[PDB]
């Protein structure tokens, strides 16, 4: 159903903004 | 078809999951 | 809703390529 | 269109995949 397809895009996006949060491991880099 | 895109995007989340399971690399800091 | 679960998996699609960008930290080996 | 949908979600599981390739990162730990 379009509600529990849209609920799961916004959970995929709001993860890979915390992996981008995690990925400031560019530290060791700068 | 729409249980299929649910399906998959199921197993997008559980593979970022992993990957943000992985990145706890940041251990080294 | 179906031409925005397509601009949805655009944006998902280029947020992992910038995360696979961030990657090339494998420099380090 | 359905098939767009289809196409796009498979280059994302295959770029996962090349991810999780990048992420064997984890040499600086073993």
Redesign the interface.
Same mark, same amino acid.
């Given at each position: 159903?379009?509600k529990? $397809? #849209?609920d *799961?895009?916004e #959970? /995929? =996006?709001s *993860? %890979?903004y915390? /992996? #981008?949060x #995690? =990925?400031x $491991? *560019?530290x %060791? =880099?700068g």
């Open positions: 159903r379009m529990q $397809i #849209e *799961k895009l #959970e /995929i =996006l *993860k %890979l915390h /992996i #981008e #995690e =990925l $491991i *560019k %060791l =880099l």
